[PDB]
mmCIF file of C-alpha atoms in Angstrom:
data_model
loop_
_atom_site.group_PDB
_atom_site.id
_atom_site.type_symbol
_atom_site.label_atom_id
_atom_site.label_comp_id
_atom_site.label_asym_id
_atom_site.label_seq_id
_atom_site.Cartn_x
_atom_site.Cartn_y
_atom_site.Cartn_z
ATOM 1 C CA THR A 1 0.000 0.000 0.000
ATOM 2 C CA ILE A 2 1.292 3.485 -0.996
ATOM 3 C CA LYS A 3 0.422 6.526 1.184
ATOM 4 C CA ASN A 4 0.836 9.754 -0.855
ATOM 5 C CA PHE A 5 1.192 13.138 0.942
ATOM 6 C CA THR A 6 2.605 16.120 -1.063
ATOM 7 C CA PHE A 7 -0.165 15.720 -3.726
ATOM 8 C CA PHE A 8 -3.515 17.320 -4.725
ATOM 9 C CA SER A 9 -6.774 16.004 -3.165
ATOM 10 C CA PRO A 10 -9.583 16.281 -5.819
ATOM 11 C CA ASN A 11 -12.538 15.856 -3.397
ATOM 12 C CA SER A 12 -10.443 17.498 -0.561
ATOM 13 C CA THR A 13 -10.275 14.114 1.323
ATOM 14 C CA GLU A 14 -7.763 12.073 -0.801
ATOM 15 C CA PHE A 15 -4.345 13.007 0.697
ATOM 16 C CA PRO A 16 -4.512 14.325 4.311
ATOM 17 C CA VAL A 17 -1.054 14.994 5.799
ATOM 18 C CA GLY A 18 -0.547 14.320 9.528
ATOM 19 C CA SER A 19 1.924 15.646 12.126
ATOM 20 C CA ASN A 20 3.948 12.373 12.075
ATOM 21 C CA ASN A 21 3.971 12.334 8.213
ATOM 22 C CA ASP A 22 5.349 15.907 8.090
ATOM 23 C CA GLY A 23 7.575 15.049 11.086
ATOM 24 C CA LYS A 24 9.249 12.174 9.167
ATOM 25 C CA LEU A 25 9.449 14.436 6.045
ATOM 26 C CA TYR A 26 11.268 17.264 7.938
ATOM 27 C CA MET A 27 13.781 14.763 9.462
ATOM 28 C CA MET A 28 14.819 13.409 6.013
ATOM 29 C CA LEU A 29 15.300 16.955 4.578
ATOM 30 C CA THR A 30 17.766 18.097 7.302
ATOM 31 C CA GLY A 31 19.215 14.591 7.827
ATOM 32 C CA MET A 32 18.478 13.935 11.525
ATOM 33 C CA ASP A 33 17.622 10.955 13.791
ATOM 34 C CA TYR A 34 15.647 10.747 17.098
ATOM 35 C CA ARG A 35 18.954 11.306 19.021
ATOM 36 C CA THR A 36 19.756 14.822 17.639
ATOM 37 C CA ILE A 37 17.957 18.235 17.487
ATOM 38 C CA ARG A 38 17.745 21.444 15.419
ATOM 39 C CA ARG A 39 18.020 24.335 17.911
ATOM 40 C CA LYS A 40 18.318 28.124 17.407
ATOM 41 C CA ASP A 41 18.421 30.888 20.045
ATOM 42 C CA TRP A 42 16.783 33.912 18.325
ATOM 43 C CA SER A 43 17.253 35.844 21.602
ATOM 44 C CA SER A 44 19.925 34.783 24.161
ATOM 45 C CA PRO A 45 18.442 32.817 27.136
ATOM 46 C CA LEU A 46 18.484 34.583 30.533
ATOM 47 C CA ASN A 47 20.005 32.977 33.663
ATOM 48 C CA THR A 48 18.471 34.141 36.989
ATOM 49 C CA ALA A 49 19.733 32.269 40.139
ATOM 50 C CA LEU A 50 19.475 28.413 39.777
ATOM 51 C CA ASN A 51 17.015 28.789 36.822
ATOM 52 C CA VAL A 52 17.384 29.191 33.014
ATOM 53 C CA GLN A 53 14.710 31.060 30.986
ATOM 54 C CA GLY B 150 7.232 72.530 60.080
ATOM 55 C CA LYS B 151 5.655 75.893 59.117
ATOM 56 C CA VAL B 152 7.763 79.092 58.672
ATOM 57 C CA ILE B 153 6.975 81.825 61.269
ATOM 58 C CA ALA B 154 8.419 85.388 61.310
ATOM 59 C CA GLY B 155 10.721 85.875 64.314
ATOM 60 C CA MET B 156 10.465 82.174 65.296
ATOM 61 C CA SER B 157 12.151 80.518 62.242
ATOM 62 C CA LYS B 158 15.737 80.964 60.921
ATOM 63 C CA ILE B 159 15.208 83.433 58.019
ATOM 64 C CA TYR B 160 16.703 86.829 57.129
ATOM 65 C CA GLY B 161 13.428 88.776 56.811
ATOM 66 C CA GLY B 162 11.828 92.199 57.238
ATOM 67 C CA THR B 163 14.163 95.217 56.764
ATOM 68 C CA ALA B 164 17.110 94.654 54.336
ATOM 69 C CA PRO B 165 19.587 92.848 54.415
ATOM 70 C CA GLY B 166 17.456 90.622 56.683
ATOM 71 C CA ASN B 167 17.330 89.931 60.449
ATOM 72 C CA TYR B 168 16.911 86.992 62.876
ATOM 73 C CA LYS B 169 16.817 87.747 66.633
ATOM 74 C CA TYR B 170 18.141 85.655 69.550
ATOM 75 C CA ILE B 171 15.328 85.681 72.133
ATOM 76 C CA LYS B 172 14.862 83.504 75.285
ATOM 77 C CA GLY B 173 12.697 80.465 74.493
ATOM 78 C CA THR B 174 11.172 81.783 71.231
ATOM 79 C CA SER B 175 14.590 82.687 69.555
ATOM 80 C CA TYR B 176 15.269 80.730 66.286
ATOM 81 C CA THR B 177 13.966 77.224 65.509
ATOM 82 C CA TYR B 178 14.747 75.592 62.118
ATOM 83 C CA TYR B 179 11.559 75.206 59.974
ATOM 84 C CA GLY B 180 12.405 71.753 58.593
ATOM 85 C CA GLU B 181 14.865 70.183 56.153
ATOM 86 C CA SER B 182 15.418 70.644 52.396
ATOM 87 C CA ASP B 183 13.909 67.508 50.803
ATOM 88 C CA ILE B 184 12.158 66.098 53.939
ATOM 89 C CA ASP B 185 10.546 63.490 51.562
ATOM 90 C CA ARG B 186 13.748 61.357 51.830
ATOM 91 C CA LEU B 187 13.040 60.474 55.521
ATOM 92 C CA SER B 188 10.832 57.394 56.048
ATOM 93 C CA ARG B 189 10.604 55.122 59.122
ATOM 94 C CA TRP B 190 9.257 51.548 59.234
ATOM 95 C CA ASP B 191 8.803 51.676 63.033
ATOM 96 C CA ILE B 192 8.935 48.428 65.046
ATOM 97 C CA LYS B 193 7.542 49.025 68.562
ATOM 98 C CA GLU B 194 7.079 45.463 69.945
ATOM 99 C CA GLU B 195 9.054 42.207 69.255
ATOM 100 C CA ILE B 196 7.632 40.405 66.176
ATOM 101 C CA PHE B 197 8.204 36.672 65.415
ATOM 102 C CA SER B 198 7.362 36.249 61.641
ATOM 103 C CA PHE B 199 6.216 38.311 58.568
ATOM 104 C CA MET B 200 4.908 38.206 54.942
ATOM 105 C CA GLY B 201 6.562 40.977 52.906
ATOM 106 C CA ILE B 202 5.952 41.817 49.202
ATOM 107 C CA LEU B 203 9.131 43.606 48.012
ATOM 108 C CA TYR B 204 9.344 45.432 44.632
ATOM 109 C CA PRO B 205 13.033 45.801 43.523
ATOM 110 C CA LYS B 206 14.647 48.827 41.838
ATOM 111 C CA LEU B 207 18.000 47.943 40.183
ATOM 112 C CA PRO B 208 19.120 44.531 38.903
ATOM 113 C CA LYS B 209 22.388 42.889 40.108
ATOM 114 C CA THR B 210 22.431 45.213 43.113
ATOM 115 C CA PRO B 211 21.480 43.427 46.376
ATOM 116 C CA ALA B 212 17.731 43.952 46.959
ATOM 117 C CA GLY B 213 15.764 43.235 50.143
ATOM 118 C CA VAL B 214 15.285 44.422 53.757
ATOM 119 C CA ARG B 215 17.615 45.170 56.712
ATOM 120 C CA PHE B 216 16.697 45.561 60.392
ATOM 121 C CA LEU B 217 18.294 47.998 62.874
ATOM 122 C CA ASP B 218 18.090 48.090 66.686
ATOM 123 C CA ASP B 219 17.428 51.065 69.037
ATOM 124 C CA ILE B 220 21.078 52.277 68.672
ATOM 125 C CA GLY B 221 21.162 52.013 64.846
ATOM 126 C CA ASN B 222 22.999 48.653 64.562
ATOM 127 C CA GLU B 223 22.021 45.913 62.095
ATOM 128 C CA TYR B 224 21.163 42.525 63.706
ATOM 129 C CA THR B 225 19.641 40.713 60.650
ATOM 130 C CA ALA B 226 18.995 41.282 56.888
ATOM 131 C CA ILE B 227 17.098 39.399 54.148
ATOM 132 C CA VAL B 228 18.775 40.533 50.910
ATOM 133 C CA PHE B 229 18.995 38.990 47.368
ATOM 134 C CA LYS B 230 21.328 39.554 44.368
ATOM 135 C CA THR B 231 19.331 38.621 41.212
ATOM 136 C CA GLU B 232 20.501 38.870 37.567
ATOM 137 C CA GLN B 233 17.329 40.578 36.290
ATOM 138 C CA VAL B 234 14.772 42.937 37.927
ATOM 139 C CA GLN B 235 12.041 40.824 39.526
ATOM 140 C CA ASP B 236 8.489 42.283 39.385
ATOM 141 C CA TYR B 237 8.379 41.440 43.133
ATOM 142 C CA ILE B 238 10.087 39.239 45.761
ATOM 143 C CA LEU B 239 7.486 37.433 47.904
ATOM 144 C CA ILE B 240 9.036 36.530 51.255
ATOM 145 C CA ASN B 241 7.521 34.613 54.154
ATOM 146 C CA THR B 242 9.523 34.288 57.393
ATOM 147 C CA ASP B 243 7.103 31.720 58.885
ATOM 148 C CA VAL B 244 9.144 28.734 60.202
ATOM 149 C CA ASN B 245 6.630 26.048 59.045
ATOM 150 C CA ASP B 246 6.461 27.153 55.406
ATOM 151 C CA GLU B 247 9.446 29.462 54.810
ATOM 152 C CA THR B 248 9.199 31.092 51.335
ATOM 153 C CA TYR B 249 11.767 33.270 49.536
ATOM 154 C CA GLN B 250 10.496 33.500 45.972
ATOM 155 C CA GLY B 251 10.912 36.061 43.193
ATOM 156 C CA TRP B 252 8.268 36.767 40.571
ATOM 157 C CA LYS B 253 8.718 38.004 36.989
ATOM 158 C CA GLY B 254 5.511 38.014 34.928
ATOM 159 C CA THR B 255 3.711 34.688 35.533
ATOM 160 C CA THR B 256 6.979 32.841 36.411
ATOM 161 C CA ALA B 257 7.928 32.017 40.053
ATOM 162 C CA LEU B 258 11.640 31.655 40.908
ATOM 163 C CA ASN B 259 13.105 30.318 44.208
ATOM 164 C CA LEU B 260 15.495 33.031 45.499
ATOM 165 C CA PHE B 261 16.933 31.133 48.522
ATOM 166 C CA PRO B 262 20.416 30.271 46.995
ATOM 167 C CA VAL B 263 20.903 33.870 45.706
ATOM 168 C CA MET B 264 20.267 35.312 49.253
ATOM 169 C CA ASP B 265 23.054 36.675 51.522
ATOM 170 C CA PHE B 266 23.385 34.042 54.287
ATOM 171 C CA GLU B 267 25.827 36.099 56.445
ATOM 172 C CA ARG B 268 23.473 39.101 56.940
ATOM 173 C CA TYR B 269 20.418 36.924 57.805
ATOM 174 C CA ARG B 270 21.452 36.178 61.436
ATOM 175 C CA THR B 271 17.941 35.985 63.051
ATOM 176 C CA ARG B 272 14.183 35.696 62.300
ATOM 177 C CA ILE B 273 13.130 37.406 65.585
ATOM 178 C CA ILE B 274 12.772 41.144 64.898
ATOM 179 C CA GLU B 275 13.583 43.491 67.829
ATOM 180 C CA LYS B 276 12.463 47.052 68.772
ATOM 181 C CA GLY B 277 13.832 49.602 66.281
ATOM 182 C CA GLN B 278 13.409 50.328 62.556
ATOM 183 C CA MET B 279 13.539 48.575 59.139
ATOM 184 C CA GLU B 280 15.336 49.828 55.998
ATOM 185 C CA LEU B 281 14.625 49.081 52.305
ATOM 186 C CA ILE B 282 17.681 47.958 50.284
ATOM 187 C CA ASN B 283 17.300 48.676 46.509
ATOM 188 C CA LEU B 284 13.464 48.691 46.826
ATOM 189 C CA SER B 285 11.014 51.079 45.150
ATOM 190 C CA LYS B 286 7.905 49.841 47.043
ATOM 191 C CA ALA B 287 7.220 47.345 49.912
ATOM 192 C CA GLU B 288 4.054 45.849 51.492
ATOM 193 C CA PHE B 289 4.367 44.186 54.940
ATOM 194 C CA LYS B 290 2.104 42.013 57.116
ATOM 195 C CA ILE B 291 3.393 41.516 60.674
ATOM 196 C CA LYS B 292 2.404 38.658 63.039
ATOM 197 C CA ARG B 293 3.192 39.140 66.764
ATOM 198 C CA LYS B 294 2.476 36.642 69.634
ATOM 199 C CA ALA B 295 0.259 37.016 72.771
ATOM 200 C CA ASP B 296 0.243 34.209 75.406
ATOM 201 C CA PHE B 297 -3.277 34.793 76.845
ATOM 202 C CA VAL B 298 -6.147 36.661 75.145
#
């Protein structure tokens, strides 16, 4: 069985794309496994006492 | 205090002014320039615990409260050196559920490890006054014991 995702749905029900389907898709594009991340600090995190925001 | 002619230290009337030394009435200073600086958090009886809501002024500068005795000597002080300006520092001195937490927005931070441990010698507050270290505003609730009522 073939599950198509990045394709047109004629009756708007044919190819619904889920969070796991897009999740797997995004992993393959960047080349990552379940042991690594993609992290970016847009604004430097603040450290107040024994806490990190 | 109000300014009164002849009673207060002023050079008034006929030029170039005049203030007379009398017996009893003489010259009494009206007040002090910028009397708004003087504020006293008077402690009249020995208190055992309190719930203060402290609003800090400057970040990275120790912020909190200090307590002085009848002779102007510090006996204890709850003070904290935080990295950023907390919206308020909620402190409870109650023994059973001691709380020293800082608040910024909707986030609650435990401020106990950032506190100055040397200055905080006692919980029992004695007769004297309280000072505000790096605080813009403060709200206090004092609980004092009575054996029989």
